[PDB]
Write a protein that binds this ligand. Structure first.
Ligand SMILES: *[C@@H]1O[C@H](CO)[C@@H](O)[C@H](O)[C@H]1NC(C)=O
Lengths: 48, 50
């Protein structure tokens, strides 16, 4: 099975995680049904 | 015999529920490792159906 939770937290901090309370609301289901042991994110680049 | 159906008689572990395995990998049936080459105690786990 699969579940996605998310919440748009509004912050005005600098570096670390915020202090306060806020929960996440489920959005998406997507039953791929395979062996998942790792995940990787994407980082965009820029050229001068 | 329609030999288009295959099955995996040989493997190392028993699968967890709701898992798929279509890989074609050798298995060791004794004390002699296969290392990708057939021989003694080394068989292809997929066998066609007669
Ligand atoms: C997932 O893959 C790892 C190695 O890639 C294997 O050891 C494990 O048994 C696999 N699990 C399932 C449920 O397929």
């Amino acid at each position: 099975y699969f579940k996605i939770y998310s919440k748009h937290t509004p912050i005005n901090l600098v570096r670390d995680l915020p202090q306060g309370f806020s929960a996440l609301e489920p959005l998406v289901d997507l039953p791929i049904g395979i062996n998942i042991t790792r995940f990787q994110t994407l980082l965009a680049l820029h050229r001068s | 015999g329609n030999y288009n159906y295959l099955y995996r008689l040989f493997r190392k572990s028993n699968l967890k529920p709701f898992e798929r395995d279509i890989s074609t990998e050798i298995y060791q049936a004794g004390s002699t490792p296969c290392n990708g080459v057939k021989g003694f105690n080394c068989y292809f786990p997929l066998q066609s159906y007669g």
